[PDB]
Design a protein around this ligand. Structure first.
Ligand SMILES: O=C(O)CN(CC(=O)N[C@@H](Cc1cnc[nH]1)C(=O)O)Cc1ccccc1
Ligand SMILES: [Zn+2]
Length: 953
């Protein structure tokens, strides 16, 4: 018997493939706990989920729960140092984060498996005795505000909050969850409110043990984990807080039958249809929501999306249930619009109700239900091993909704067939309770309303009774055929025997002029899956902006035409990735290896015999134009990274150049482009997973034979296989490129300190980056509060590497950069003052991060694929570079800094991208040289040397 524990669960149902061991238990204070033992893991992890979220914010203090979530990381009674947590994790190869939904606040971390307990103590202190330091508050409010301002110009966010603003204003749903400087500091100060003490009341009141779930994953035995969790979490007090429920829908009748005309930030065209539904959560065993969402959202032949696309009205459609809260959900149907579809919105919706009516006519179909059940069963049984962090987080989340023994299977396995529930939801989908939203720039100037928090321009209308009735009298329709049996359902899950000459690394099993084939039979995971990667090399992909555009449009048209067919396979766990690149095309095929050669053959066959459809052509090209235009509205740091890419790459076409050259792209010219693109090719492939060498060779030769047969493809010259170099900066040089964002009123910046990627250089850079990793965050954000987005680390491109800082701040870069340099000096000092053992802890942390084994096939394949597309082929890079990493001493790093990075360093290579805003104590900052301002990227690149290329392994 144990008094600290209320109950121990039964056997937790898991996949037969899952070797991890589980134990569920509820503590005396009512904390639901899942323990995961996995002796083979490198990183241990833990997560805690509170069942309180932004919907429980005080009406006078918006975002208090979010702010609290931020503040917990900044000191507790037992661990008072503001960054003890993040420093501990960083020093022990760990990371951490958290988030806040309307109903939940979820905290999570990972760390080296040998410091799991140490991390977990500090973690546990968050829910017992948090400090909420006043200085910490006055500072972090800036970080939260900056987070919000980041989201302000984001269309998705604006719409997200708009839906809340258009509902019952007295309903908690209408609350603004993020919070900012105004709502957290300014307004409360105006109203005498002591924020710290509001935070303490919220924590004390709502952070009760009875509203908490905990998941812990480690190498230790289940009994050890038990003892640990009991020890650290039995002291959490139970205040028996009643679980907040929201039975009343935020959308009642006068909020129904409404139209909303909305002005976006980007040039997009969208249609959002919404139905209020009850909370279907409790029916998870049958789940009508998925049923109707699968049908409505289906993209196969005979489908709604198929029809509406045939009329050239829409391009993409999503449909199904979206969650609201405990007491209410939604059922949405959203499409993107063409220029024509925008003028036929009513008709589109009528078609929607026609499809719905067709469903009502044919009723619930059990065979459909079983198809869903079996597919989910396969998915669950052969589910890839998750990263411990996201795993513990997810499980801690879903512990509040499901019985212990079912927490793993609950979201996957279906048991009950409920025609009644299906028909009931289906009955709730009717014009009398519909909400319609149009998002288009065509409403600019013609709106009469403004959303408070994001400043969204919109107009509300009542939908004419007449129209409602045309939609009620919706006929069923002959343009629609319900989906048939999915042919791509896998039947062969046999894991092929491991060959005698099988290699631990990808072997080069083909080296012809036509193709270079790398292969590996999976030795670790033993699933019935496979990954098939293909890099097609053709100089005509990126020879000029015109051909670049044509490549993009070619592959987009291809994918579009094959969507209807591929969707079945997608549902059946088999998906494909296809897109153009600076070097030519890229095509990956991932999933169950059973029907893979079928899908692939179809891909290549269609690829080589593609007949372009003109409607599709000019619609897609219009979309692409809008897209290029819409890069304008991207965030300042994305702008900075973009500009820097352009500066440091030998050959690169700007989006303005692309856009300009896009008008000259005619149908005959593209139709002429494709065969010349396919005329001469090279193919470097990586086939990895549950397949034999002979199978792999057969596949590669199948693709080659298809291309030769239908496109008369011939090999490419070896010398012709070009590669782009990186611009070489001069010693002690500083260059600055300046632009303006025009959309965000927020400045972005990237600082880049440039040699090539040799083992030594690599580990110098990476170790330094490790040492400064968390101090940079703590200094630039936690202390100085420059922005929400403060990033630092290695930059790798074209075989050449450097150290980058990226910041998105309210302040100007001419000052921001100064703060960065000052910080750099601070690091020069702290390295000289840190102990050799601390140094060795950084070394160890980085070593662990580098030696962390992948847990799923795709990750391994990703490592290999990196090694291949970089054309370095160092498959044993981890072992080699870690071995050399532990060789290093403190002053290898000291002279590295003093020679390459210091402000007066002899080989300092500094490039700064300054993206200005729309409208434009502390440490000692060093006096900087006068920068040379780039006023033309090409002239700049012509005036400078180009780096060499890394030699393979
Ligand atoms: O990504 C999720 O899991 C969430 N969504 C689920 C969904 O609707 N899945 C659809 C996907 C689909 C693709 N094409 C047709 N349907 C399905 O039934 O397969 C809902 C949602 C909520 C909030 C904002 C966006 C979307
Ligand atoms: Zn946040």
């Amino acid at each position: 018997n144990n008094p600290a524990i209320k109950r121990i669960g039964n056997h937790i149902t898991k996949s037969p493939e899952d070797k991890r061991e589980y134990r569920g238990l509820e503590l005396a204070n009512g904390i639901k706990v899942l323990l995961i033992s996995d002796p083979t893991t490198d990183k241990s992890s833990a997560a805690l989920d509170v069942h309180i979220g932004s919907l429980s914010d005080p009406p006078n203090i918006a975002g208090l729960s979010h702010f609290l979530q931020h503040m917990l990381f900044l000191g507790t009674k037992k661990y008072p140092k503001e960054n003890e947590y993040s420093q501990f994790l960083s020093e022990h190869a760990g990371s951490s984060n958290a988030f806040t939904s309307g109903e939940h606040t979820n905290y999570y971390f990972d760390v080296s498996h040998e410091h799991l307990e140490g991390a977990l103590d500090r973690f546990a202190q968050f829910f017992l005795s948090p400090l909420f330091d006043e200085s910490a508050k006055d500072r972090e409010v800036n970080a939260v505000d900056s987070e919000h301002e980041k989201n302000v110009m984001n269309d998705a966010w604006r719409l997200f909050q708009l839906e809340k603003a258009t509902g019952n204003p007295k309903h908690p749903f209408s609350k603004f969850g993020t919070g900012n400087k105004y709502t957290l500091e300014t307004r409360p100060n105006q109203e005498g409110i002591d924020v710290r003490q509001e935070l303490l009341k919220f924590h004390s009141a709502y952070y009760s043990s009875n509203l908490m779930a905990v998941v812990v994953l480690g190498r230790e035995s289940l009994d050890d984990l038990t003892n640990l969790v009991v020890k650290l979490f039995s002291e959490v007090e139970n205040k028996n807080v009643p679980l907040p429920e929201f039975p009343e829908h935020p959308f009642q009748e006068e909020h129904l039958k409404q139209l909303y005309k909305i002005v976006p930030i980007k040039d997009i065209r969208n249609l959002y249809v919404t139905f209020p539904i009850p909370d279907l959560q409790k029916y998870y065993k049958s789940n009508p929501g998925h049923y109707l969402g699968h049908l409505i959202g289906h993209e196969g032949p005979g489908s709604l999306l198929s029809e509406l696309k045939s009329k050239g009205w829409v391009n993409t459609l999503v449909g199904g249930q979206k969650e609201g809260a405990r007491g209410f959900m939604f059922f949405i149907i959203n499409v993107d619009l063409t220029e024509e579809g925008l003028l036929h919105v009513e008709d589109i919706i009528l078609h929607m109700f026609q499809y719905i009516q067709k469903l009502r006519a044919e009723g619930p179909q059990e065979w459909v239900f079983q198809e869903l059940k079996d597919l989910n069963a396969v998915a669950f049984r052969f589910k890839d091993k998750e990263r411990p962090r996201g795993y513990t987080s997810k499980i801690a989340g879903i512990l509040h909704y499901y019985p212990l023994e079912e927490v793993l299977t609950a979201e996957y396995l279906l048991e009950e067939f409920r025609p009644d529930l299906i028909e009931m939801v289906l009955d709730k989908l009717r014009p009398e309770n519909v909400r319609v939203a149009i998002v288009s720039k065509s409403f600019e100037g013609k709106t009469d309303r403004t959303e408070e928090w994001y400043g969204t321009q919109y107009k509300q209308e009542a939908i004419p009774d007449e129209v409602i009735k045309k939609w009620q009298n919706a006929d069923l329709n002959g343009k629609f055929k319900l989906p048939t049996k999915n042919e791509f359902i896998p039947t062969n899950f046999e894991i092929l025997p491991l060959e005698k000459e099988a290699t631990p690394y990808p072997a080069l099993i083909k080296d012809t002029a036509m193709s270079k084939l790398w292969f590996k039979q999976d030795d670790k995971f033993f699933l019935p899956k496979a990954n098939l990667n293909f890099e097609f090399f053709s100089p005509f992909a990126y020879v000029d902006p015109l051909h670049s555009n044509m490549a993009y449009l070619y592959l987009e048209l291809l994918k579009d035409s094959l969507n209807e067919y591929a969707y079945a396979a997608e549902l059946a766990g088999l998906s494909y990735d296809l897109q153009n690149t600076i070097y030519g095309m890229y095509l990956s095929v991932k999933g169950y290896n059973d029907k893979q050669p079928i899908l692939l053959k179809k891909i290549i066959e269609k690829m080589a015999t593609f007949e372009i459809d003109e409607k599709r052509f000019e619609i897609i090209k219009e979309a692409y134009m809008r897209s290029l235009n819409n890069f304008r509205a991207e965030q300042p740091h994305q702008h900075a990274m973009y500009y820097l890419r352009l500066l440091m790459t030998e050959v690169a076409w700007t989006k303005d150049e692309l856009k300009e050259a896009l008008d000259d792209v005619t149908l005959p010219r593209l139709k002429a482009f494709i065969p010349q693109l396919l005329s001469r090719l090279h193919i470097e492939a990586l086939l990895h997973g549950n397949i034999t060498k002979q199978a792999a060779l057969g596949i590669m030769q199948m693709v080659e034979d298809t291309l030769i047969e239908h496109a008369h493809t011939k090999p490419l010259l070896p010398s012709q296989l070009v590669r782009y170099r990186e611009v070489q900066l001069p010693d002690r040089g500083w260059f600055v490129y300046q632009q303006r964002n025009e959309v965000h009123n927020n400045s972005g910046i990237e600082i880049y300190y440039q040699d090539m990627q040799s083992t030594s250089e690599n580990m110098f850079l990476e170790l330094f980056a490790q040492i400064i990793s968390e101090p940079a965050f703590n200094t630039l954000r936690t202390k100085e509060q420059l922005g929400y987005i403060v990033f630092s680390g290695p930059r790798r491109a074209n075989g050449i590497q450097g150290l980058r800082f990226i910041i998105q701040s309210e302040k100007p870069p001419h000052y921001l950069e100064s703060r960065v340099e000052a910080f750099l000096i601070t690091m020069e000092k702290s390295i000289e003052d840190m102990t050799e053992e601390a140094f060795q802890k950084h070394i160890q942390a980085l070593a662990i991060r580098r030696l962390d084994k992948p847990k799923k096939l795709s990750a391994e394949s990703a490592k290999y694929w990196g090694e291949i597309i970089s054309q370095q082929y160092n498959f044993d890079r981890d072992n080699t570079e870690v071995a050399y990493l532990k060789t290093l001493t403190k002053e290898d790093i000291i002279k590295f800094y003093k020679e390459m990075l210091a402000v007066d360093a002899p080989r300092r290579h500094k490039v700064s991208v300054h993206v200005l805003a729309r409208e434009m104590n502390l440490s000692q900052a060093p006096a900087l040289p006068q920068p040379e301002v780039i006023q033309n990227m090409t002239e700049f690149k012509r005036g400078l040397p180009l780096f060499p290329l890394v030699k393979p392994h």
